[PDB]
Design a binder for this molecule. Structure first.
Ligand SMILES: Cc1cc2nc3c(=O)[nH]c(=O)nc-3n(C[C@@H](O)[C@H](O)[C@@H](O)COP(=O)(O)OP(=O)(O)OC[C@H]3O[C@@H](n4cnc5c(N)ncnc54)[C@H](O)[C@@H]3O)c2cc1C
Ligand SMILES: O=c1nc2n(C[C@@H](O)[C@H](O)[C@@H](O)CO)c3cc(O)ccc3cc-2c(=O)[nH]1
Length: 475
């Protein structure tokens, strides 16, 4: 009990399995939560309507959970460097708790806020919550960060795994006197999506909120997971969890997700299952690899990390970029993926690799243009993972690899052999023959209004290799 402790939420929108929140409840029952609508983020051109819609639904639930627990979630709108210390001063808060992040913006903001709180004589405690292992814990024998997945995985996998922490209960709300002291800093109501200027009708991979995310984890683990491998390969198959946005925003705790995978892996008697489960567990490790990477090498966010890739002579033809964004490339597998993206705010992972390779190696456009278009549409848009996926398409950052220019055709054959996914997103081509949809060779008569390939794959492959080889001669 005692004076109030403020817990500042940002990307951990849940009451359960929250490290910082659990640590705070151990210090006082007068635990008040807050979320600050930050214009520097919400007004950025990098916002996606699906993503704000998801965020807004998570906050609605969180307001309720706090009310049910005994206190409330305070809502502010403005610059946190200014509003957080002021709010804490007015409430003479004993401390302000929050969970650390890996993003440059987040880390700079947090330092300023912490500095301001100290100046005010108020304690700020920042703990690690969104990762099973913090960036400081996973280092090589020489005490250096990993820039290659292999060694990172062997280390990460051998570390003892933490257990989910308890959900705080029996909280005590603020008094009328305290509410009066802060009234001028508060928002009276959670704004609606239209009030923020966004609209979204495309649905979600998982419904917003802590309850839904938890329900989905349980469900994925009682059935799906067992078949993860190889079901995750096929875009037509609903083989993945659909939890990506819940993990981006912390609607589900990472220790709860790992624990569920552990349990499922033990109850499983089939060796095939035990494998699908271990494959999903590695996907959680890829997530941390990319988050630790941005933490250790922040410059990654600025563009190509490897020097030569910084000098690459991208062609950058706007006309090709536009057709890409509009799903008018003429390459079925590609256009189908781009339609799923813009219509639903989500895209199967195999398709993200395919459209990324396409933009970088076929269209020869600086991948940063693609990185930004993705952030503007993805419900799970996440700087670390998106930047990691795009650097991947060019081997310009972490975990590099030898050149390999994909053939959309081949990929289609491999992952959409029957063209089910393609026709799902390109109905105007339902009449066409799989063989044709996979190959991309459609007769002008049965293919309709649908465009012809905007580029010739083989001519593009040579062009790219040529630009790449010329360059290698001056590095
Ligand atoms: C170009 C590109 C951009 C990407 N952008 C994002 C993005 O902005 N946000 C995002 O969450 N993921 C991104 N990824 C990875 C991506 O494929 C997603 O994690 C998505 O497919 C998850 O769907 P799911 O939740 O069903 O995944 P599952 O297969 O169920 O995996 C479970 C969780 O593991 C994590 N994960 C899975 N694959 C990866 C991966 N390759 N890298 C990092 N984490 C991974 C995610 O948190 C995911 O929710 C990107 C990948 C590429 C190639
Ligand atoms: O504190 C906030 N965090 C927001 N975040 C959550 C976090 O990513 C976080 O603030 C930072 O750590 C990002 O550096 C958003 C993330 C999105 O992708 C989209 C919108 C937001 C909006 C906010 C916001 O208004 N306030």
């Amino acid at each position: 009990m005692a004076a109030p402790i403020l817990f500042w939420h940002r990307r951990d929108l849940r009451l359960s399995d929250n490290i910082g929140l659990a640590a705070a409840r151990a210090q006082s029952a007068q635990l008040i939560g807050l979320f600050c609508l930050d214009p520097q983020i919400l007004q950025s051109a990098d916002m996606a309507p699906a993503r704000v819609a998801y965020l807004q639904g998570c906050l609605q639930e969180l307001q309720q959970r706090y009310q049910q627990a005994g206190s409330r979630l305070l809502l502010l709108q403005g610059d946190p460097q200014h509003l957080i210390p002021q709010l804490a001063q007015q409430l003479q808060a004993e401390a302000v708790y929050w969970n650390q992040d890996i993003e440059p913006y987040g880390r700079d903001r947090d330092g300023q806020v912490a500095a301001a709180l100290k100046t005010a004589g108020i304690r700020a405690v920042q703990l690690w919550d969104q990762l099973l292992h913090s960036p400081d814990q996973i280092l090589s024998g020489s005490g250096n960060p990993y820039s290659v997945y292999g060694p990172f995985w062997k280390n990460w996998q051998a570390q003892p795994k933490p257990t989910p922490v308890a959900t705080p209960t029996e909280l005590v709300d603020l008094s009328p006197e305290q509410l009066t002291a802060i009234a001028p800093l508060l928002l009276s109501e959670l704004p609606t999506l239209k009030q923020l200027g966004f609209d979204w009708d495309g649905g979600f991979p998982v419904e917003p909120g802590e309850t839904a995310a938890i329900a989905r984890l349980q469900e994925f683990c009682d059935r799906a997971i067992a078949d993860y491998d190889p079901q995750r390969n096929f875009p037509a198959e609903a083989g993945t969890s659909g939890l990506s946005p819940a993990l981006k925003f912390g609607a589900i705790g990472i220790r709860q997700a790992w624990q569920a995978a552990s349990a499922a892996h033990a109850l499983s008697r089939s060796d095939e299952a035990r494998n699908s489960i271990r494959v999903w567990q590695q996907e959680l490790a890829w997530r941390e690899f990319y988050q630790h990477a941005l933490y250790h090498f922040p410059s990654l966010a600025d563009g190509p990390y490897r020097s030569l890739w910084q000098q690459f002579p991208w062609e950058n033809r706007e006309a090709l970029f536009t057709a890409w964004t509009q799903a008018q490339t003429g390459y079925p597998i590609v256009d189908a993926a781009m339609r799923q993206l813009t219509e639903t705010g989500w895209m199967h992972n195999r398709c993200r690799m395919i459209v990324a390779s396409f933009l970088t190696k076929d269209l020869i456009i600086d991948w940063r243009r693609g990185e930004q278009f993705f952030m503007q549409h993805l419900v799970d848009g996440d700087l670390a993972a998106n930047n990691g996926g795009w650097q991947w398409s060019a081997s310009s950052g972490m975990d590099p690899k030898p050149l390999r220019i994909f053939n959309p055709a081949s990929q289609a054959k491999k992952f959409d052999a029957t063209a089910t996914y393609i026709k799902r997103w390109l109905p105007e081509l339902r009449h066409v023959h799989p063989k044709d949809l996979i190959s991309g060779e459609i007769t002008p008569i049965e293919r309709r209004g649908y465009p012809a390939p905007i580029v010739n794959h083989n001519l593009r492959q040579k062009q790219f290799k040529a630009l790449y080889n010329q360059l290698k001669a001056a590095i």
